[PDB]
Design a protein around this ligand. Structure first.
Ligand code: CL
Ligand code: ZN
Lengths: 112, 111, 112
């Protein structure tokens, strides 16, 4: 019955060999799942840089249309005269702020 | 050859011991991806809020430049006269739409 | 001492049977994980399409405000006169560019 305990130890090993395989099946879809995370963060970071491009072009161009509008309304007391207090509203320069967040996403996910 | 079957039983146990280790590594990886997923969704959601900020300032500011241009062109039949039917085109207010989507990404991933 | 090696082989099998159990306890929590990557890429791709909509409306509307400003400044030598060389700066049409990137993120992650 030594040869018996050895046939049982062999059955165990056969069955816990089955599990190892099944397990590997579930925990299987997970390697590049990190590489897929590094790619989502890359394309995203790319579309965000095209918006910063466009967005800063609109800001400059529209601030230039106010420079012209300020000239034309001079002969009227100025823009603040024709527009009211809204003449004070101007678009901020979110370039650096937006830039720094786009750099974080990269450093944190794409360079890693 | 009893001592043989016992040397093989020992090699299996050696190899299925290696798997357990490797598996624990993945079962340890996906935690990273689970977490890292909630962080990409956070930063992204942050850069999207700065664009909503910038974008609505441009919309308001440019609607105000048309209010001035509307005044100046009065002595000409009005903007619709100088510009044609495009005088009807105005930028929509996507603030709520954009806002709802940024709220989804947060609720779904950051919270 | 054969019955000894058999007692040790039996202890290992007992301990590597404990791991298999504990591992099974963790494993479960990770495979909708691939459906989580597909979802971040989805919403993201949705918020980027609303910005492309907004962004192109600002560009068109602002180019139309320059058309009006070009007319009013005619009785002065033209905008290029009142504004200088910046009169040449105009906002580009990043529609296609931004569109193609949003289609990449989709194909690669949402539709994939
Ligand atoms: Cl404008
Ligand atoms: Zn001995």
């Amino acid at each position: 019955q030594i040869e018996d305990k050895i046939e049982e130890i062999l059955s165990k090993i056969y069955h816990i060999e089955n599990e190892i395989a099944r397990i590997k099946k579930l925990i299987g879809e997970a390697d590049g799942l990190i590489e897929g995370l590094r790619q989502l963060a890359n394309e995203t970071t790319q579309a965000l840089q095209l918006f910063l491009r466009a967005t800063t072009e609109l800001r400059t161009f529209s601030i230039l249309n106010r420079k012209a509008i300020d000239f034309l309304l001079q002969r009227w007391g100025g823009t603040c005269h024709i527009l009211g207090p809204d003449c004070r509203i101007e678009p901020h320069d979110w370039t650096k702020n937006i830039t720094d967040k786009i750099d974080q996403i990269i450093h944190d996910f794409v360079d890693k």
